[PDB]
Amino acid sequence: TYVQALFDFDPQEDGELGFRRGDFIHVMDNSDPNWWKGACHGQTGMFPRNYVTPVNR
């Protein structure tokens, strides 16, 4: 399952996943309706669900 970032996300907080608009993120945990865990750029972390869109579509 991959999602595409629709916006840049540049967190300060540890445990949060950073990415740029257009990046593809491998979703690791989408159980919570608001914060998902994903993998990108050699790291994993949490990010707000509404920053990304499903690639399958």
Next chain:
Amino acid sequence: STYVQALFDFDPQEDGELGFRRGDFIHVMDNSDPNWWKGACHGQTGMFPRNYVTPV
């Protein structure tokens, strides 16, 4: 040899489309389709949205 001027910016979304900035002059090459016309601007040709321009 007709020219139109861009009312708004336009970034090509699909290949073959022609982009432009508001104010750019575009040479109309083919106005056969109702919504997308072939034109030339900044050394390139491609399809542009007719509703983004006005005749000069």
Next chain:
Amino acid sequence: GSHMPKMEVFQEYYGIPPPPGAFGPFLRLNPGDIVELTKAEAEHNWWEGRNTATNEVGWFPCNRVHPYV
């Protein structure tokens, strides 16, 4: 609705500029409206969604919205 991202509108959009080539109907947006996206790609400037503040559907410039947080 479905499992798609939601956006909060921060800038109004009343159909100007119109969707390129009128490929689809424009979606009126008012600051504060929450739009549930139906079609979106990072590389594209025009996204489709359902404005849940008005229950209308259509296309709008992605530069008028940001993630609903």
